[PDB]
Structure 1
C-alpha cells in the first residue's frame, strides 16, 4: 500500500538494510521495477523528478503509480518527488497523491537552505507527507567547488529543519560517467557513520547507479557509444548501507538496461518494428539488472515486516 518514507526508511535503518529508490518515466520502467521488487518481496520507492512529471504530463505518471499500488496491494510503496526545487513543486506533488518529497536547496547557503526546507517541512508534515532535504552538493572529488557534507553541520541542519531523511554529499554525481576510470574511484564514505549518529535519521545516497558490466557491454556491442562509463561499485554501497544509508537513488542503470536491450533487438532482428518487440526486452532487462542489486541492498524479504501507516495517521507523528 502507499507508504511514507519516514516509516519505510525507519524500518531499513532499524534492521540495517537499504531501500532502492528508482526513478520512473513511463509504463515499462514501472513494470520492470515492480516485477523485481514483487519477486523479492521487497519494499520500494518509486520516484518522479520534475522532468518525469513534465514528460508524462503529470496525470499519466500519477495514473501509472496508481496502477502499481492497486496491482500489488501487499507491497509498501512510497511515491516520492525527486529534486523538488520549490514549495510549489511540493504542493503539486502532494496534490497528485505522493507520500514523500525531496526539497533540494543544497546550492543555497546554509541559512537559506534551512529556510526553504523548513517551509516545505511545515506544509508536508501537516499532511503526514515525508521530507528528504540535502546538505552538501553532488559531484566528483577529483579549484574545486564540490561541497562535501560536514557532519557537525548535518547535525545542526537536521535539528533546525526536522526533516525525516537527509541526502549527503560524499563524492557521487548523477550520470554514467562518475569517475575518470575504474581504477580512479574515490568516495568519501567514512563520514556516513558519523553523520548517521549525529543526526539520528535515515541517510540518502544520490548518483548511486553502478553501471554493471553486462549492461554497459551490451550497449557498446550494439552501436552504442559509452566506452568510458563507470558507476559506484556495489560493495561500496553495501558498506555505506551498513553505516547508515537507507535509501539509494538509481536511475542511470535502468536507463542503460532498457537502451542496451533495444539496441540488441534492432541489430539481431532488423525487420521488427513493433515497439512491444523491443520495449518488452527492455522492461525485462530492467527487472534482471535490478534483482541482484536489490538483494545486495538487503531489502529483499522485508515487504511483509510491518503494518503500513497511512498519511492521515502519519500526521500524528508530527503532533
Structure 2
C-alpha cells in the first residue's frame, strides 16, 4: 500500500539493502515500474520531480499512483517529491498526498540549508510525511556537518554528496565515489541515506539506444559494482531516472525506424514499457530489495 517513505527506508536501513527510487512522468513509466516491483517482490519508491509534476499535474501524479497502489495492494509504495526547490512546493506535495518530500537546499551555506530543511520537516512531520535533504556539492559532504544537520533538523533521510551527478554524463574519466566519506556519514548519522544520480547506463541499454540511431556521446554512469559498494556503505534509497528514459526511448526510436507506417501509440510504448520494466527488475535485484515484501 501507499506508506510514509520512512516505513520503507527504515527497514532498508536496518537490514542493509537499497531501494530504488524510480522517477516517472506518465502512465507508461509508472506501469512498468509497478510491474517490476510486483515481479521481483520488491518495495517501491515512486518519485516525481517538479517538472514531472508540472507536466502531469499534481492531481494526476498522485491519482495515478493511488490507482496503481490499489492494483497492487501488497507492495509497499512511497510517493516522493524529488528535488523540491521551495517550502511551498514541498507543502503543495504534502497537501496533494505525497508521502515523502525532498528539499534540496544544498547550494546554501550550512546554516541556511539547516533552517529551510527544518521548516520543511516541521510541516511534513505534522502531516505524517517523511523528508529527504541534501548536503554537500560536487565541496563534498562534511560528515561532522551531516551529523549535526540530522540531529538538529530531524530529517528522515539524507543525500550526502560523495561524487555523483545527474544525467548520462557523470564522469569525464573513470568513475569514482568517496566511499570513505559515505561510511563516516553513515556511522555518525545512523539514518537511511540517499544516492542521487545513480543511473548505471548498462551496456545493453546503451547498445539498444545507439542501434536505434540515438547518440550518447561520452555517456558514463555509476558502475554496478559501485552501486553495490554504496549499499554496503549505507545507501538505502537509490535515485534512478536516466536508465529508464534511455531504455524506453530506445524502443520508441526502434519502432519509428522499422515501420514508417506505424502510428498506434501502443505499438511504440508496449516494447518501451518492457525495456524499462527490465531495467527496474535488474536494479531491484542488484540493490537487494527483491523478495523483501
Which residue pairs with 1:33 in the alignment? 33
Matched, 1:198 2:168: no
SS at match of 1:291: helix
CA distance in 2, matches of 1:74, 1:278: 30
**Aligned equivalent of 1:133:** 133
Q: 1:253 aligns with which of 227, 240, 243?
A: 243
In the alignment, what sits opposite 2:118?
Answer: 118
Distance in 2 between residues matched to 1:190 and 1:296, nearest whole Å: 21
Partner of 2:273: 283
Report the CA distance between 1:66 and its aligned residue. Answer: 1.2
Report whether the alignment pairs 1:187 with 2:177.
yes
- Which residues in structure 2 correspond to 1:289-304 (within 5 Å)? 289-303=279-293
Provide Cα deviations, 1:211-250, integer angstroms capped at 9, x if missing partner. Answer: 0111111111121111311100011111110111100000
1:38, distance to aligned residue in structure 2 (A): 0.5
Match of 2:64 in 1: 64
| Alpha-carbon offset, residue 57 of structure 1 | 2.0
Q: Distance in 2 between matches of 1:86 and 1:196?
A: 27
What do you get for the CA RMSD once the two structures are aligned? 1.0
Q: Does 1:170 align with 2:162?
A: yes
Structure 1 segment 39-54 matched on structure 2, within 5 A:
39-54=39-54
Cα deviations by residue, 1:81-133 (Å, 9 ceiling, x for unpaired): 01111111011001111111001110001000010011111111111110111
Question: What's the TM-score, normalizing by structure 2?
Answer: 0.98
Looking at structure 2, the residues matched to 122 and 79 of structure 1 have their Cα atoms a distance apart, in angstroms, of 19
Tell me the equivalent position of 2:259: 269
Runs of at least 4 residues off by over 6 Å:
none
2:2 and 2:66 in contact (8 A); partners too: no
Bigger CA drift: 17-26 or 210-219?
210-219
Q: Distance in 2 between matches of 1:62 and 1:202?
A: 24
Contact 1:220 1:227 in 2 (8 A): no
1:269, CA displacement in angstroms?
Answer: 2.2
Aligned to 2:18: 18
**Any unmatched runs of 5+ in structure 1?**
138-145, 304-319
User: Number of paired residues?
Assistant: 293
Taking the aligned partners of 2:190 and 2:216, their CA distance within structure 1 comes to 40
**d(CA) in 1 for partners of 2:183 and 2:237?**
15
Q: Structure 1 stretch 294-303 or stretch 223-232: which is displaced more?
A: 223-232
Query: How far apart are the structure 2 equivalents of 1:61 and 1:13?
Result: 27
Q: TM-score, normalised by structure 1?
A: 0.90
Q: Does structure 1 residue 221 correspond to structure 2 residue 211?
A: yes
Superposition deviation, residue 285 in structure 1? 0.6
Query: Deviation per CA, 1:37-70, whole angstroms, max 9, x where unpaired?
Result: 1101100100011100001122222221111111
The structural deviation recorded for 1:271 is 1.8
- The answer (yes or no) to whether the contact 1:101–1:131 under 8 Å persists in 2 is yes
SS at match of 1:171: coil
Q: Answer whether contact 2:2 2:78 (CA < 8 A) is retained.
A: yes
Is residue 17–residue 241 contact of structure 1 (8 Å, CA) maintained in 2? yes
Residue 100 of structure 2: aligned partner = 100
Q: Kindly provide the CA deviation profile for residues 240-283 of structure 1, in whole angstroms up to 9, marking residues without a partner as x.
A: 10111100000000000111011111122222111111111111
